[PDB]
Design a protein that fits this description.
Number of strands: 39
CATH topology: Methanol Dehydrogenase, Chain A
Protein name: Alcohol dehydrogenase
Helix content: under 10%
Distance between the termini: 21 Å
Structural class: mainly beta
InterPro entries: PQQ_b-propeller_rpt, PQQ_rpt_dom, Quinoprotein_ADH-like_sf
CATH class: Mainly Beta
Strand order of the largest sheet: 1-33-34-35-36
Shape: globular
CATH architecture: 8 Propeller
Pfam families: PQQ
Cofactor: pyrroloquinoline quinone
Bound molecules: pyrroloquinoline quinone, chloride ion, zinc ion
Family: Belongs to the bacterial PQQ dehydrogenase family.
Length: 562
Amino acid sequence: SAIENFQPVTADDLAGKNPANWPILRGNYQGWGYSPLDQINKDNVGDLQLVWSRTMEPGSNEGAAIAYNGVIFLGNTNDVIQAIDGKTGSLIWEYRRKLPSASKFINSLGAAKRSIALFGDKVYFVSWDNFVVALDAKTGKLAWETNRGQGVEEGVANSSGPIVVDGVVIAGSTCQFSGFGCYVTGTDAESGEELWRNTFIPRPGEEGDDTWGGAPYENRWMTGAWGQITYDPELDLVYYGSTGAGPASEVQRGTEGGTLAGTNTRFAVKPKTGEVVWKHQTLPRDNWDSECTFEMMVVSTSVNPDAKADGMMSVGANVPRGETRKVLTGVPCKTGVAWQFDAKTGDYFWSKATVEQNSIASIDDTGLVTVNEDMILKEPGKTYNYCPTFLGGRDWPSAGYLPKSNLYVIPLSNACYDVMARTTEATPADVYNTDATLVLAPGKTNMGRVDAIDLATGETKWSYETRAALYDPVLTTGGDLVFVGGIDRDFRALDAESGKEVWSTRLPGAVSGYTTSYSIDGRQYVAVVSGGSLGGPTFGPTTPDVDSASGANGIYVFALPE
Ligand SMILES: O=C(O)c1cc(C(=O)O)c2c(n1)C(=O)C(=O)c1cc(C(=O)O)[nH]c1-2
Ligand SMILES: [Cl-]
Ligand SMILES: [Zn+2]
Ligand SMILES: [Zn+2]
Ligand SMILES: [Zn+2]
Ligand SMILES: [Zn+2]
Ligand SMILES: [Zn+2]
Ligand SMILES: [Zn+2]
Ligand SMILES: [Zn+2]
């Protein structure tokens, strides 16, 4: 019944023009993570009840209920993709990919799936074995698939999911365990043909090669773009970020003093060709697995950064003070530093630290980052007391935007990392080749944190804290609410004006996935993916007083009583 009248998904849908739907990971191309739906608000959220839920596949459950005209399209782990009736929770269809033995995959991160994408009459995803796959939206049956190469034993995969722009399926990659770097590809949405492929590691003698400290090309590992892809329709620019290089220690990399051009860089590209329009490196010389690959939002804001605002690193030399600009803005890296650029040109406006961090010594008025020499891993076996951690700070769990108050709302972890490079020689399988102990940041007794930052001034308007890590995306809504899960297993709503908790329910496991909102027949639903991820096992032991069990992977859907 729900799938019967399926109407093709357009750019207008993906631009978030219909608030009854959530047809893309962050609700719109621009990455807002916002639902304009306002039925559920501060005055009635206390009445929210569980309407329906459904078991999801085991593993790291970081997915998102992609909602479209009464149907939920849901990427589970293990390349299981489902369509579910958004009103009843009844399964409509299920695709289950035939997988080689899990042991054959050197990159287990490809098993988790933050999103599927929609366009036309198809559901698009990247499989664990690194195929761009198109399913029929109406049936879940495979329409086409294209092998990108180097999957499985060779470890190239994807965890965040693609987006489709102008008939082009755009998808990044993780090559976390590989002795090489990876890429972002653009694939024709109809034919399945690969149209372009952007890589990051400079080839010998090419632009930026001289910033790799003389490291042989074949020793340059793991540079990818595994985070979330965003897009601005008006500028026609696709935005993504690349990551660092492994192992973490530049001494073990053989890249001493190397700023590593291509790594941790924010790219703005044309969707049909991958042509780079502008780029900015937000974390050079990375020794801290900083991964500047997370979603960056496109918003229109007045530009008036306060140089005295807490954490403000610098203000751009040519900042158009008092003027309204379309900006690319947010926290791109685990470090927790918020950035703001002109979205069209890439001109640097400002940057501001959130959590305690000590990897960045300074950022000048052009946006040039200078790293902290004290934190470069120069002596293997020596403990370096890095802030934040290889899980942040921030990590993949996405921020949300509140257009009414111009607030950027970001989930964060108050953690630091006593990190040491191993004394043994690094192989690709060793990843960062470090051993670490995670601790609370100095003077912090609350691990979980959400900052709400005014995008005009860079001032933090409020900060919500809780004992255990959140490590879960936020949803912002027109009802003036912020929804967020945590490893404490609470799925909570915060007052968007104050950051104070106004409602919560406790789910059976750590609330580990995305929260989305949609409506059917005038009724607003709030859907959260839960069960657990790397967050609980990593942050849980720091606050053992909190019951942060993982389990009962599932989608859980709430609404006001009828
Ligand atoms: O370098 C990479 O290719 C890559 C990929 C992934 C992934 O795809 O999930 C993570 C990381 N790195 C990473 O460093 C880490 O912070 C991390 C946490 C998570 C998670 O699911 O909670 N994924 C990843
Ligand atoms: Cl529609
Ligand atoms: Zn539509
Ligand atoms: Zn990584
Ligand atoms: Zn725009
Ligand atoms: Zn720049
Ligand atoms: Zn816009
Ligand atoms: Zn101020
Ligand atoms: Zn509560």
